[PDB]
Design a protein around this nucleic acid. Structure first.
Length: 76
RNA sequence: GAAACUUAAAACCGUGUUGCACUGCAACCCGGAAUUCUUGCACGUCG
């Protein structure tokens, strides 16, 4: 390629049904329910982490490549 | 024997990512019981 490059991909992600990425034992004591969602610590906005997006796309691509080669991939 | 500084000058310094892989996930009907019912003549009065 004879170059160093950094390509970035932008877009939007709109939610069609209710989205729940659980937070566990983050924060509570007003408006707290049995299963809360993750939030930004300062702006208190709902967020989507990049750990749950990388781990879901890597799992859906490992089922497709795995079934089309008759091999079950047991670990990353 | 009484009398004349093994002194002067000199950075423990230069280079180095606490970094690489990892879905807060799987299973769960806001469901089960309950009559918009009880009483009521389209009728009375005729130089």
């Amino acid at each position: 390629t004879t170059s160093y490059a950094k390509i970035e991909i932008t877009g939007t992600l709109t939610v069609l049904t209710g989205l729940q990425i659980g937070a566990g034992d983050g924060f509570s004591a007003i408006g707290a329910v049995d299963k809360p969602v993750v939030r930004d610590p300062l702006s208190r906005l709902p967020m989507i982490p990049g750990t749950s997006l990388k781990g879901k796309v890597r799992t859906l691509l490992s089922r497709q490549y795995g079934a089309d080669t008759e091999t079950f991939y047991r670990k990353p």
